[PDB]
Amino acid sequence: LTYGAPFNFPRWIDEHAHLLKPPVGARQVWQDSDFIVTVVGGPNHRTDYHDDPLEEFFYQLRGNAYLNLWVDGRRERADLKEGDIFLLPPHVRHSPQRPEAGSACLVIERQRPAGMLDGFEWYCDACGHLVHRVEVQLKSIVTDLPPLFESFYASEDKRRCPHCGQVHPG
């Protein structure tokens, strides 16, 4: 059993509560597995939209959250109330918002094969145009992703909408 024996999930989440809040916010359950199994806590709000080339499964175990989406060219919202499950199709742009402390969401993804890239995008609050997109071969979320977000927040040029000129807040 490469990934160990079964174990009690609510107790695991309790024992990792200190990591399910800022600044960490999430915790992957097993390492080096094909299924990426993560528990995401809160609070955490964010402005980036994720373009995942594969599906994402959600089961909101504790508390409530919601996903800001782009669907059919329009901004939409999918609520993840406590007890909700949800399967997100590939490439649907989503921005998870997790307002509640003590919340916990099971999120399951697949490891991306080489050449299958993730995208992270920001959109203009004023005119809705795409402001900035980075594509990334996502291997370790811990090292591959934070610098991406920091480099966007640090640069007015990256944050500048090419259509209406308004600078994204970061």
Q: Rounded to whole angstroms, how far apart are CA atoms 66 and 68?
A: 7
Q: Rounded to whole angstroms, how far apart are CA atoms 84 and 60?
A: 6
For a copy of itself, the binding residues in 79-138 under the rule CB under 8 A are 79-81, 83-90, 92, 106, 108, 110
Site for Fe ion (CB under 5 A): which residue of 39, 44, 52, 68?
A: 52
The neighbour count for residue 117, using CB atoms within 10 Å, is 13
Is 18 one of the annotated binding-site residues? Answer: no
Q: Which does 150 bind (CB under 5 to 8 A by kind): a copy of itself, Fe ion, none?
A: none
Burial-class residue 26 by CB neighbours within 10 Å (0-12, 13-18, 19+): buried
- Binding window for a copy of itself (CB under 8 A); candidates: 27-35, 119-127, 138-146, 160-168: 27-35
The number of residues that bind a copy of itself (CB under 8 A) is 40
Site for Fe ion (CB under 5 A): which residue of 124, 132, 138, 168?
A: 124
Q: Rounded to whole angstroms, how far apart are CA atoms 38 and 59?
A: 11
CA atoms within 13 A on the CB side of 52: 20
Tell me how far, at minimum, the Cβ of 4 lies from Fe ion, in Å. Answer: 18
Positions that interact with Fe ion (CB under 5 A): 50, 52, 124, 126-127, 129, 161, 163-164, 166
